[PDB]
Design a protein around this ligand. Structure first.
Ligand SMILES: O=c1ccn([C@@H]2O[C@H](COP(=O)(O)OP(=O)(O)OP(=O)(O)O)[C@@H](O)[C@H]2O)c(=O)[nH]1
Ligand SMILES: [Ca+2]
Length: 323
């Protein structure tokens, strides 16, 4: 049935989605950071990616940003100049470099009025993240059920303490791919087609990887899946609770039938295997430990049990209660 659960899902959806107002502050912060960048490098561009760009932002959202510049210009030089201009403009944060890759991490804004905890990560030439944000952004426009589905899943994973890459669970981006995977390759009929495997997809090579997909969205026929949000969510929890085999299988967007063993791939960390759709050497779930997976699986099981429970009224609220 799922009528009540669906009603409940939309109610939570509206409380947790980014408000127009905060979204408008975010775009202002972005404008401010761009002006600071122009002062230091007029040719470079500052772009948003992740949840703020794809339309998948919860309240109190962090910002993922990327500086695009000429590949002949050394990224660490302008990274530092940029960082020095931010400090001088009253931002607080850190300048760091992992191997070759410089990163700025802004944690605050003492002047411009964008928070006391304004959290903002600035990368340099992370073109791949821009592209995979384009993909998620495109699926978002393809069916209206995806956005609230994702926000609810993100909310759930956060409440259940299974959204921590540093303490052995999965990034939000990983849960998005787990949602997309289910909606493309598991649910029948499919909610979505695989845009990477579209016969209309054109190759596009960026940093060695094919980032190509079919983005003529207007020419794609709508879903023949008519499930309510509630139903989709129940299918999603059920599949990862009971059917998906994490020890043996890979979440993938590179197989017409979504079938990929860990072995084919040489992925025997790989406790939870999610192959990025574009950077296919990158296991999005490499942060997941053995005890993190146990907890991720347990929470999936408990979510399936709750939604399948026969004791009425079903306490749908327990879905978002702290673990
Ligand atoms: O493994 C990763 C993780 C991150 N990303 C890139 O970084 C972006 C942000 O990564 P997040 O995990 O923060 O996604 P999110 O913004 O949607 O989640 P919340 O903040 O709402 O919790 C992702 O959308 C993707 O573009 C990767 O490319 N690979
Ligand atoms: Ca983010």
């Amino acid at each position: 049935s799922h009528k009540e659960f669906t009603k409940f899902c939309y109610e939570v959806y509206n409380e947790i989605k980014i408000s127009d107002k905060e979204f408008k502050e975010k775009r202002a912060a972005l404008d401010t950071l761009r002006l600071c960048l122009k002062r230091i490098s007029p040719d470079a561009e500052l772009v948003a990616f992740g949840s703020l760009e794809s339309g998948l932002a919860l309240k109190n959202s962090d910002m993922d940003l990327c500086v695009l510049m000429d590949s002949r210009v050394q990224s660490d030089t302008i990274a530092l100049q940029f960082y020095e201009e931010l400090i001088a403009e009253g931002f607080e944060g850190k300048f760091l470099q992992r191997a070759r890759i410089p990163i700025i991490k802004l944690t605050s804004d003492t002047k411009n009025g964008f928070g006391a905890s304004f959290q903002c990560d600035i990368g340099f030439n992370n073109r791949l993240a821009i592209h995979n944000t384009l993909l998620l952004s495109s699926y978002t426009k393809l069916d209206a059920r995806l956005k609230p589905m994702v926000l609810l899943v993100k909310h759930w994973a956060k409440r259940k303490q299974i959204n921590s890459p540093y303490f052995g669970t999965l990034s939000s981006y990983g849960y998005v791919l787990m949602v997309l995977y289910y909606l493309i390759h598991v649910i029948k009929p499919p909610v979505f087609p695989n845009l990477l495997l579209s016969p209309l997809k054109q190759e596009k090579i960026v940093d060695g990887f094919d980032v190509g997909f079919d983005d003529k969205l207007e020419d794609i026929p709508p879903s023949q899946n008519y499930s309510s949000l509630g139903s989709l969510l129940h299918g999603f929890f059920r599949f990862y609770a009971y059917k998906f085999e994490p020890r043996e299988k890979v979440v993938t967007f590179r197989r017409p039938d979504g079938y990929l063993t860990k072995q084919e791939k040489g992925w025997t960390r790989y406790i939870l295997a999610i192959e990025d759709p574009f950077e296919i050497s990158h296991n999005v779930g490499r942060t997941v430990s053995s005890s993190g997976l146990y907890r991720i699986r347990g929470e999936f099981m408990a979510a399936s049990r709750l939604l399948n429970s026969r004791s009425y009224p079903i306490p749908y609220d327990s879905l978002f209660e702290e673990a």
